Design a protein around this ligand. Structure first.
Ligand code: FTI
Ligand code: HFP
Ligand code: ZN
Lengths: 401, 312
C-alpha cells in the first residue's frame, strides 16, 4: 500500500520548529492516522482493504426510513437526507424498492413549494440547497413519477425570484448569497431543461470573481479559496459551458495542492485538516478539469488517470473514514453521518474510475468488491441518471414566457 | 419569557396563554421517509409554530416562540424568516435583537442563517459600529471561521472601514503565520486599498513574505501569497527572484522552493530567454524530482507539467 510503505513516513509534517495552532492540530491528525496505518504491523495480519458494504447498506437502509432525535438539527434538510442515502445506496449498487421510491417521491412532493422549488421539509419555504437535493433524488429514482413531481414552470419562476443583478442568486427569498446558489440553480435548471436565454445572465462572470489569488474559488468575491465552493463554481461553469472564464492553470495547481501528502485525502482550504467529504468536493475537480483542459485541446493530459493520487485517496477512505457499524466519516474519531457517507463514497468512486473519451482505467483498491457504481462529476449522481433525466425533460419545451 | 432549559419549563400544549390555538402537526405523509423522531419538546414547539405561522399570527407570543423554535433548530431558515417579519411588523427594538443574534452566533458560529440574520439587522440599522469587535471575538475562538471572515469583508467593503484592518491582519499573522484566512485577508485589504502596483508596496510585501518563508520554509500560505502577488506581472520580470530563492535551496528548502522555481522557469520560457534549452532541462529535472522523490502525492500533476513543458 502506498501509505503503509516506509518512505511515506517522510511525508510527515515539517514543523520548522516554529509551531503554531495549525502545526499542532495537523500533527495531531497525522499521529491518529499513523496509528491506523500501522494498525496492521502491530497486530500481525495481512492488510485487507474492504468496503463494509453490507454494514453500510444496513445503516443507509434504516436512515431512509427514520432517524433519532439526534437528527433534529437537519430537520430543515430532509431532501438532503433522501439524496445522501439514495445516492450512497446508488453507489453501493443497492436496491431502491418500487414502494420506497414512491414514498420518497410523495414526500418530496410535500416539500415542494407552490411557488416552485423545495423546502427542507413539509411546509418549509423553498431553498436552493433542498431544491438541488430533491431534484437529484428524483433523478436517482428516475421514473415518470419521480420526474413528474418536479414543477418546471414553477421552478423557473422561483429561480428567477432569486436572481441578482450582479449575476448571483439568493439561496432563498430573504436569504444569503454565495456560490452554492449558482451551482444549485444551474444543476436543477439544466437537468429539468428550464434554462432560458437570460436566466444565468452574468452568472459566469460573478462566479469568476470568486476565484482569488490562490487559484481557488471562494464563497463570494474576495473570500478564501474553499473546496466546497470551488466545486460549486467550477461545476457551475462546466454546466454553463464557461469553465474558460477562469484561470484553469492556477485552479489546477491549487486543487492538486489540497491533497495531503501524508494522509492521502484532501483538505478544504490551504493549511486546514483532511476531511473525508472533500474526497469529492476537491477530488471531483480534476475530472471536471480534465474535460475542461482537453476541451481546449490539451496534449499533456493522461489517458488513464486523474491529476491526483487515486491510490492514496482510496487508502485514506478505506482505511481511515469507514465506520465499523456502518457509515463513513470525516476522519478517525469523528462521528458518522449520511453526508460524509454520501461524500466519502462519491470520492472513492471518483478515485476508482477514470475516463477520457473511450479510455477507461478504473483503479480499485483492495477487495475488487470495493468498486462502486460511477458518479457524474458535475451532478454527483450516476452518469446514467443524468443522461436519462436531461433527455426526458428535453422533450418538454423550456418554460418560455 | 420561559427558557427551554428552565427546570420549570412547560409544554405549549400545557400553557394557559396558548389554548386558543390548535397545534398544527407536521404532515410527512401516510408513509414517511427520513422521518425524525422528535422529542415531545421539539414536536410541541413546532406543532405550535406550524399554527402561528399558518395563521400568520404576527404576535408577540408568536415572536417569543420562534425563539424557542430557533433554539431547537437554529438551522431552520423558515422560522428565521418569519422572525424577521415579526421584527418589522411588531416593530421590535433591533439593537435588542442585535444582542440576541450576538449570543446565538457565539453558540453556532458556523450556522448560515445566524450570520445572514445579523447582516440584515446591520443593514436595517445602517450601523457597522459593533461588527469588527464582534467578529474579532469570534475569530478569537476560531481564527478561521469562514462565515466570520466573510461577514467581516462585507462590513469593511460596504461601510468602507479599511483603515485599521491591515494592522489586524498583522496581529493575527503574528499569532499563527500559517493562518491562510489572514494571508487571504491581507490580500483582500491591500488589493482594495493601495494595490500591489506601487513599487514600494510590492517590495515591502515580497520582503515580508520572503521573511515568513525564510522563517517557516514549509508553511505553504506564505509561498502561495508570494507567488500570488508576483505571478500577476510575471515572475520572470524579477531577475533577482530566481537567485534569492536559489540561495534558499539548502537553507530553507521544501518542495515549495522547487515548485516555485519550476514556476519561474515556466515564465522565463513563456517570455523566451537565452539558455532556454538548459532552463527547460533544469525545470524538467525539478519536475521529475518533485514527481519521483520530492512530492509524489501529486506525481500525476508533476509529470503533466513535465509534458506540457515539452509542447510549450
Ligand atoms: N451531514 C452532515 C453535516 C452537516 C450538513 C447537513 C446538511 C447538508 C450539508 C451539506 C454540506 C455540508 C454539511 C451538511 C453540517 N455540519 C456542519 O455544519 C459542520 C461542517 C463539517 N464539515 C463542513 N462543515 C461546514 C458546512 C456546514 C453547512 C453546509 C451547508 N449547506 C456546508 C458546510 C456537520 C454535519
Ligand atoms: C452544493 C453544496 C451545498 C455544496 C456545499 C459545499 C460545502 C461543503 C461548503 C462548506 C461551507 C463552509 C464555509 C464551511 C466552513 O464552515 P468549514 O471549511 O469550516 O467546513
Ligand atoms: Zn467533512
Amino acid at each position: 500500500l502506498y501509505s503503509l510503505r516506509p518512505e511515506h513516513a517522510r511525508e510527515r509534517l515539517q514543523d520548522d520548529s516554529v509551531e503554531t495552532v495549525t502545526s499542532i492540530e495537523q500533527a495531531k491528525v497525522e499521529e491518529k492516522i499513523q496509528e491506523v496505518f500501522s494498525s496492521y504491523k502491530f497486530n500481525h495480519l495481512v492488510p485487507r482493504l474492504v468496503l463494509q458494504r453490507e454494514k453500510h447498506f444496513h445503516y443507509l437502509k434504516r436512515g431512509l426510513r427514520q432517524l433519532t432525535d439526534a437528527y433534529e438539527c437537519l430537520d430543515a434538510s430532509r431532501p438532503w437526507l433522501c439524496y445522501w442515502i439514495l445516492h450512497s445506496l446508488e453507489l453501493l449498487d443497492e436496491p431502491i424498492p418500487q414502494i420506497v421510491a414512491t414514498d420518497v417521491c410523495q414526500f418530496l412532493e410535500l416539500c415542494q413549494s407552490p411557488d416552485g422549488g423545495f423546502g427542507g421539509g413539509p411546509g418549509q419555504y423553498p431553498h436552493l440547497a433542498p431544491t438541488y437535493a430533491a431534484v437529484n433524488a428524483l433523478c436517482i429514482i428516475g421514473t415518470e413519477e419521480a420526474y413528474n413531481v418536479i414543477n418546471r414552470e414553477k421552478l423557473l419562476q422561483y429561480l428567477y425570484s432569486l436572481k441578482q443583478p450582479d449575476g448571483s442568486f439568493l439561496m432563498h427569498v430573504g436569504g444569503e448569497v454565495d456560490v452554492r446558489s449558482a451551482y444549485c440553480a444551474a444543476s436543477v435548471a439544466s437537468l429539468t431543461n428550464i434554462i432560458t436565454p437570460d436566466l444565468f445572465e452574468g452568472t459566469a462572470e460573478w462566479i469568476a470573481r470568486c476565484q482569488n489569488w490562490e487559484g481557488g474559488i471562494g464563497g463570494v468575491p474576495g473570500m478564501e479559496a474553499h473546496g466546497g465552493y470551488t466545486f460549486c463554481g467550477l461545476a457551475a461553469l462546466v454546466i454553463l459551458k464557461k469553465e474558460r472564464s477562469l484561470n484553469l492553470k492556477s485552479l489546477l495547481q491549487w486543487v492538486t495542492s489540497r491533497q495531503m501528502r501524508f494522509e492521502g485525502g484532501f483538505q478544504g482550504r490551504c493549511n486546514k485538516l483532511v476531511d473525508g467529504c472533500y474526497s469529492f468536493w476537491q477530488a471531483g475537480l480534476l475530472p471536471l478539469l480534465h474535460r475542461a483542459l482537453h476541451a481546449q485541446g490539451d496534449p499533456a493530459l493522461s489517458m488513464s488517470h486523474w491529476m491526483f493520487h487515486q491510490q492514496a485517496l482510496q487508502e485514506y477512505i478505506l482505511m481511515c473514514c469507514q465506520c465499523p457499524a456502518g457509515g463513513l466519516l470525516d476522519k478517525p474519531g469523528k462521528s458518522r453521518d449520511f453526508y460524509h457517507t454520501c461524500y466519502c463514497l462519491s470520492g472513492l468512486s471518483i478515485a476508482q474510475h477514470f475516463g477520457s473519451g473511450a479510455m477507461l482505467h478504473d483503479v480499485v483498491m483492495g477487495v475488487p468488491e470495493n468498486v462502486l457504481q460511477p458518479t457524474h462529476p458535475v451532478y454527483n449522481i450516476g452518469p446514467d441518471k443524468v443522461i436519462q433525466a436531461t433527455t426526458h425533460f428535453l422533450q418538454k419545451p423550456v418554460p418560455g414566457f | 419569557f420561559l427558557s427551554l432549559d428552565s427546570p420549570t419549563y412547560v409544554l405549549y400544549r400545557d400553557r394557559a396563554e396558548w389554548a386558543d390555538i390548535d397545534p398544527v402537526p407536521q404532515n410527512d405523509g401516510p408513509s414517511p421517509v427520513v422521518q425524525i423522531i422528535y422529542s415531545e419538546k421539539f414536536r410541541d414547539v413546532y406543532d405550535y409554530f406550524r399554527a402561528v405561522l399558518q395563521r400568520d399570527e404576527r404576535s408577540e407570543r408568536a415572536f417569543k416562540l420562534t425563539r424557542d423554535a430557533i433554539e431547537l433548530n437554529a438551522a431552520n431558515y423558515t422560522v428565521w424568516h418569519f422572525r424577521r417579519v415579526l421584527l418589522r411588523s411588531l416593530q421590535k427594538d433591533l439593537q435588542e435583537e442585535m444582542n440576541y443574534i450576538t449570543a446565538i452566533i457565539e453558540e453556532q458560529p458556523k450556522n448560515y442563517q445566524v450570520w445572514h440574520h445579523r447582516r440584515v439587522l446591520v443593514e436595517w440599522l445602517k450601523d457597522p459600529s459593533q461588527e469588527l469587535e464582534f467578529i474579532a471575538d469570534i475569530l478569537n475562538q476560531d481564527a478561521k471561521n469562514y462565515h466570520a471572515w466573510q461577514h467581516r469583508q462585507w462590513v469593511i467593503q460596504e461601510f468602507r472601514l479599511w483603515d485599521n484592518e491591515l494592522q489586524y491582519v498583522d496581529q493575527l499573522l503574528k499569532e499563527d503565520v500559517r493562518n491562510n484566512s489572514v494571508w487571504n485577508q491581507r490580500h483582500f485589504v491591500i488589493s482594495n486599498t493601495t494595490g500591489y502596483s506601487d513599487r514600494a508596496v510590492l517590495e515591502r510585501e515580497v520582503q515580508y513574505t520572503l521573511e515568513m518563508i525564510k522563517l517557516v520554509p514549509h508553511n505553504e500560505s506564505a509561498w502561495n501569497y508570494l507567488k500570488g502577488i508576483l505571478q500577476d506581472r510575471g515572475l520572470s520580470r524579477y531577475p533577482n527572484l530566481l537567485n534569492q530563492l536559489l540561495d534558499l535551496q539548502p537553507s530553507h528548502s521544501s518542495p515549495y522552493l522547487i515548485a516555485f522555481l519550476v514556476d519561474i522557469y515556466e515564465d522565463m520560457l513563456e517570455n523566451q530567454c537565452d539558455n532556454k534549452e538548459d532552463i527547460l532541462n533544469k525545470a524538467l529535472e525539478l519536475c521529475e524530482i518533485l514527481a519521483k522523490e520530492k512530492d509524489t502525492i501529486r506525481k500525476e500533476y508533476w509529470r503533466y507539467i513535465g509534458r506540457s513543458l515539452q509542447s510549450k
